[PDB]
């Protein structure tokens, strides 16, 4: 996270760390959506152009964490994956269309003050929140700068950007399964996701029922916090029927 700040304790209890065992490194962010389902970006698990093709046994999931590196006794819970489900139409050859994946935990995780699932948006919630200028929140342990790793989980609030501006900002083909967020050069403020934040949640707090909803997944960006560029996020609501189909069939 670039130009963010330390998250507060318990601020993002759905935040999941995807951890590679060998070599020992943070792979990606992810989010807790039930006691045994974790949501992340498909490109965290499968991206042949960068020789990424992870299996269930390659990764450790760490939930409830705050420190990037310190073992947090009686706070964090580690978990293993029973099965990875990548969207069958995830487009890794081109533009990361449908950049979404689900991970089933082998055991259900106990909820606590530090571990709690985020909501997925219903139709009215999505319609009322996914508006240009409305701010969501991105969290992760990714790099602090484009060229630099944080000691603790970082957070930044970013406004959703008008789709024609998103499209003008990039040579990549943008689909309806993506949106973009970030400040414009004229707005002054800054902030972005960066390498290592991929797969973590873009969340918004409903002013109607006080609940936090995951509207996006950190998907891709041209650099980090560059003027005139914007982070792109997987449009979670548009793919929610696939999420439900997977959990309802394979849970």
């Amino acid at each position: 996270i670039v130009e963010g700040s330390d998250a507060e304790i318990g601020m993002s209890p759905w935040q999941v760390m995807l951890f590679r065992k060998s070599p020992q490194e943070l792979l990606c962010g992810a989010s807790l959506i039930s006691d045994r389902w974790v949501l992340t970006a498909a490109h965290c698990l499968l991206y042949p152009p960068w020789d990424k093709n992870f299996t269930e046994n390659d990764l450790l999931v760490r939930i409830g964490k705050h420190s990037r590196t310190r073992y947090e006794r009686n706070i964090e819970k580690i978990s293993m994956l029973e099965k990875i489900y990548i969207h069958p139409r995830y487009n890794w050859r081109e533009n990361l269309d449908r950049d979404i994946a689900l991970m089933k935990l082998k055991k259900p995780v106990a909820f606590s003050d530090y571990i709690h699932p985020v909501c997925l948006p219903d139709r009215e919630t999505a319609a009322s929140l996914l508006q240009a200028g409305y701010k969501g929140r991105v969290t992760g342990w990714g790099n602090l700068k484009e060229t630099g790793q944080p000691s603790v989980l970082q957070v930044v609030n970013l406004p959703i950007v008008e789709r024609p501006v998103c499209k003008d900002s990039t040579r990549i083909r943008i689909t309806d399964n993506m949106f973009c967020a970030g400040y414009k050069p004229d707005e002054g403020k800054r902030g972005d996701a960066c390498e290592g934040d991929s797969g973590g949640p873009f969340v918004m707090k409903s002013p109607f029922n006080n609940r936090w909803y995951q509207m996006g997944i950190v998907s891709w960006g041209e650099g980090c916090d560059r003027d005139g560029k914007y982070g792109f996020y997987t449009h979670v609501f548009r793919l929610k029927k696939w999420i439900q189909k997977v959990i309802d069939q394979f849970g």
């Binding site: 304790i9 601020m11 209890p13 039930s34 530090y114 709690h116 985020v118 609940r211 936090w212």
Partner: peptide, 17 residues
């Protein structure tokens, strides 16, 4: 039957609750 998730989803123990 998953729907939008847990009946308790999105309410943080250390803040909203």
């Amino acid at each position: 039957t998953f729907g939008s998730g847990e009946a308790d989803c999105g309410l943080r123990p250390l803040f909203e609750k």
